[PDB]
Design a protein around this ligand. Structure first.
Ligand code: NAD
Ligand code: NAD
Ligand code: NAD
Ligand code: NAD
Lengths: 336, 339, 341, 336
């Protein structure tokens, strides 16, 4: 059986998730909810500044739009309690608005005429299972009603930290992600509705420090690293594409070659490995959740003690979205 | 030490609202006593202090309860979405700078004029066909001071108007098309996403695209230069600079002209609002300038075939500070003559 | 890749934006093969820049550096680093037609340096090449070629955008005179930050990704090389703006006939083909990056301003100054190679 | 009583140095050498994308230009041995081309018709005195013939690292500078003359990793930190303005408040202190060589051991230039 999915928030993550679902057999989108009309959503699906033209035909209709002739209903309900997901057979909602990223808020979708389960496309608090595909999706059994796909940065950091910890033992660490600007930053200096005096600044014209919980919350994905990491972000003027640096001390003294070999050994469809001196535009659109860059590995040793630096790339858009849809595809197969 | 001031309120402490506040600091006859926006005083104080394109504030800013002090002088801050709930009169406010983008029509702006409100409103944008629309030093003579709502026009209008008027007075504009290559603004999306105004092009990442867009400046020029009503139209290309813009105008004229003739006519019309340059500048060179319009003699062109000519004239403007300088010139003058 | 299409061997002088994108498009045609690349650098730099491309994406295939060149899908291509075309032994690698894409030899006598006794046989300049070389916009005037030419020009990006639009408008309604503005991506000839411009251009000296930068362009004045009836009728200029590729051309004219917006748009759509596209969607510049049209007419930007019975008419066409031009350039190269003799 | 100065390389640092010298008494520029016509240099001095209009008048003349009425000679000699610095009385040369930044190369200026001293506006190798003003300018005695004003990153890092080391003892450290793009990166993807596969990439459209020697070479300015630090850079799309992050282990456990207090106590004209959540555009044009940002300080502690993070802003243009001219001014006064 195909599992019918709804998208709440047809934004950067919602629209790219829709795109990837077109190539998934076990899942199909039957309903989109946002705050606008079908022509606006159909246009944003067709044309994409950073991810290119949509691969398919899109035609606006009354009450929605057709993708290759398949009608998808569009509604514009600000309150999840008012989205009649059940009318379109939706069982799983991708909660991608940025405004319901907590357990009780996501549960608003699960009313009498709503859906059955929710995947939050963001950190969702410490009382919802938080899944980085191919790092801890084993924790799912399908009975969950609300789960989280974590953040872009968590999906980048987690395979790198886990491989390094499994091989050498992370004692403590600090993370800096140099991160594309996102839709939550202001295009020009102005009041930020979340009260962030730095996200209030022109996002494409500044290096912007910002907090991020990815390192401090890593225990949701790698329990043994709870209480071991912290970090922050520098938001910079690229419209997508990011990189995560992690500096740790380890239980073992290591060489750069030994580090790079341990990362390569852990590589898979989610965690890539490169030795090419790439830049951020080269990871736009990739499907790895995290691309380890061996060219940036460093070890600083003084008096027999080492600081170790490991670096991994990610397209905060498509890398995260590929991970999100892998998790959604797996969750849908085992949902009950 | 003096008290010869008209008290002003700012609705919308945004790019234009904050820069207007900055310029009013150097005006003796007007004083801002009340700001209304949608946020708390620390956000507004911080945005006044630090400014990506216009630099650090020239003075001290300190957050206080219910507002902030600028060089020790308290400015009250409120956060009322609806003008009917702003008690402008409590702070002695006579004139409101309506700079939110959400009340830029006569009946909307008049919401500030309730029984506990202000006496007059200046809309920092085009305000419709039924409010006096003023480009300072081009038509501020139309004001008599009895008006309750006026418009400061748009940035593009304040750039276009002195150039079009100088050209029309000298040679007679028959018809024209305008293109403004314009910085992105806060009404465009930082990344591709639903645009609340329904504009499928403003929906696109504004700092990563050349974005065509409509503009009414040329079509509505008759509010400022009546002789040019029904003679001009145009459009915009929004491009990835965070401020700074340029207006190109192509016309046919009653008289055949040379490039030197055109440039001389522009220079003879230059003043505090309409500048003149022969240096090959680029857009960053006009950020912060106080001209409403800076004619660029290096871009003038004449294309003649069979004794008929197309004429091109180009003028720079900082859509932020150029407009704001014009806006505050108009506010200062209006304040002097207000009922 | 067993086929019966005759193959002409091509060399690329200047493995830059146009040179590398030309190489990419030639991968997908069979009548032409690149067997030699000349630039000023080492093979690993060129291989890396082929593999990874900020605006046009990852190369479609494998690229591996080797001694003296690199392999593309396992096929070795020789790389040399000769500053003077007279020292490029094109003939050693069987090259018969050279793509002159350095920007430093864009005139007849300069391009002929490639045609020495151990050199090539013909040159295609990837730029305006002067008044005395045939200048070709594919699907507008490539019929002027007879195959005997030794040096030809693929014109400029702006010319390939403007030409089909101006030709269609002129054929339908008669252009009397016109002015053009192209709002154009910055290019490699602008400075990344304020600094001395080798060409002496005080505006290309300025930081290209941080400014709106006016600049000259000869596309409108030189249109007579492509559309003879429009010689002496057009002029224009450019505004370079901060996008790394993607451009748009506005043309304002007066016409022999009074027209409506719908009549203009209809005339453009009737003239559409592989080189001249037509859209009614409200797109922006990133939507044409990588497009293979030389020119994409945008019906949403058409305007007519009429006063006292006379009209100004505005028509607008998009172009990726990189891939739009390169698609046209390789169409012309492919056609030229077929008829070359 | 006025030392005459020549500028080789009227670029970003050369022109901003000229601008700052306008406002000091002891030195005056009497000769400019570059590779171009006087109108090009006059135009670039008058109009400046990131640093604003020149404060004064600039008029092109024959063989040079006038600044506020005073003629400055302009020449275009590619080889320093051909620059007759002596005929304009030039005593000290600011070597700001980027092409003569080592001892023997800079000494080409000191020919029989040349200057007597040269200040390299860049790292100049490990055999020339390397000066960060108000950190180690006391090493100069005035007899030197070639000195170095270090790099922008060094002038940022040094006062921060010195104050932290003096207070708590740095054991080892790794540095990341998130740095504006510069003139040595390509405006669009193309062959990089220095052979750098990452500086070959479009500088205003990418996050670009790159090496930097500031941390490894810190021993030239702070000898006790020789062999203790390393690091790297991420070049990002702002045209000027940068930030330096430093992660260390220390001999003493500390609090965030203790760190911030130690930095504020060390603040002076070169080393600023802020607690405001600023972004990169807020330090453009600033005259601190380094502006410590107390809002980004972090301490990560596990098992009684800590990683400590300290961060400082710098306008790689004007911050470095203010430091360079401070050193030039002092060097001129003790020159012998
Ligand atoms: N790099 C990224 O962009 C990224 C990466 C990983 C996770 N996320 C997370 O994904 C979520 C969405 O981020 P985004 O970048 O796509 O933002 P976005 O602004 O592009 O999309 C949000 C969408 O939600 C719509 N919306 C807002 N409120 C709504 C409501 N009450 N009801 C229905 N629709 C509503 C908006 O109109 C918009 O289309 C956030 O939680 C964000 O933290 C973003
Ligand atoms: N180049 C320019 O930016 C420019 C030039 C000329 C005119 N204008 C005009 O000035 C006006 C403001 O433009 P801007 O660029 O400064 O926009 P902005 O977004 O920077 O500022 C708008 C401000 O209004 C606040 N606000 C929004 N709704 C409000 C409400 N109901 N009540 C109180 N405050 C509210 C917002 O929080 C914001 O601070 C627009 O009408 C615009 O067309 C802008
Ligand atoms: N939008 C565009 O970029 C565009 C569009 C149409 C036409 N053109 C034209 O194509 C040509 C190349 O433009 P580009 O953007 O690719 O520039 P580019 O700088 O990216 O490439 C030029 C290449 O030529 C190399 N080179 C320079 N001098 C050389 C020499 N003497 N010998 C061998 N190689 C040399 C350079 O190292 C570089 O790789 C120009 O004539 C330009 O006007 C460019
Ligand atoms: N953030 C910065 O820009 C920065 C900061 C600190 C130090 N530096 C250092 O300052 C130096 C210059 O940097 P920049 O950014 O100002 O570069 P730039 O390209 O802006 O200026 C260099 C100038 O030198 C000219 N020039 C080149 N070769 C010459 C030669 N043989 N003879 C005479 N003039 C020549 C060039 O025409 C140019 O004007 C570099 O060593 C650089 O590492 C730069």
């Amino acid at each position: 059986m195909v599992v019918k999915v709804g998208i709440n928030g047809f934004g950067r993550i919602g629209r790219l998730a829709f795109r990837r679902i077109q190539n998934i057999e076990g899942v199909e989108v039957t309903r989109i909810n946002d705050l606008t009309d079908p022509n606006m959503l159909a246009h944003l699906l067709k044309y994409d500044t950073t991810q290119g033209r949509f691969d398919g035909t899109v035609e606006v209709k009354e009450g929605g739009f057709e993708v290759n002739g398949n009608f998808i209903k569009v509604s514009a309900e600000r309150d999840p309690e008012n989205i009649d997901w059940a009318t379109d057979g939706v069982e799983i909602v991708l909660e991608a608005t940025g405004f319901f990223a907590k357990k009780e808020a996501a549960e608003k979708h699960l009313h009498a005429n709503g859906a059955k389960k929710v995947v939050i496309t963001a950190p969702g608090g410490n009382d919802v299972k938080t899944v980085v595909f191919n790092t801890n999706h084993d924790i799912l059994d399908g009975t969950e009603t609300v789960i989280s796909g974590a953040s872009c940065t968590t999906n980048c950091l987690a395979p790198m930290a886990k491989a390094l910890h499994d091989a050498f033992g992370i004692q403590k660490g600090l993370m800096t992600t140099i991160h594309a600007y996102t839709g939550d930053q202001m295009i020009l200096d102005g009041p930020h509705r979340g009260g962030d005096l730095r996200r209030a600044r022109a996002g494409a014209a500044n290096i912007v420090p910002n907090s991020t919980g990815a390192a401090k919350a890593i225990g949701l994905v790698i329990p043994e690293l709870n209480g071991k990491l912290d970090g922050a972000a520098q938001r910079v003027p690229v419209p997508t594409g990011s990189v995560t640096e992690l500096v740790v001390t380890l239980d073992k003294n290591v060489s750069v070659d030994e580090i790079n070999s341990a990362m390569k050994a852990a590589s898979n469809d989610s965690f890539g490995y490169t030795e090419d001196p790439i830049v951020s535009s080269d990871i736009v659109g990739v499907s790895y959740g995290s691309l380890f860059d061996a060219t940036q590995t460093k070890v600083m040793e003084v008096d027999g003690s080492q600081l170790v630096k490991v670096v991994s790339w990610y397209d905060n858009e498509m890398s995260y979205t590929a991970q999100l849809v892998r998790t959604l595809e797996y969750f849908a197969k085992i949902a009950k």
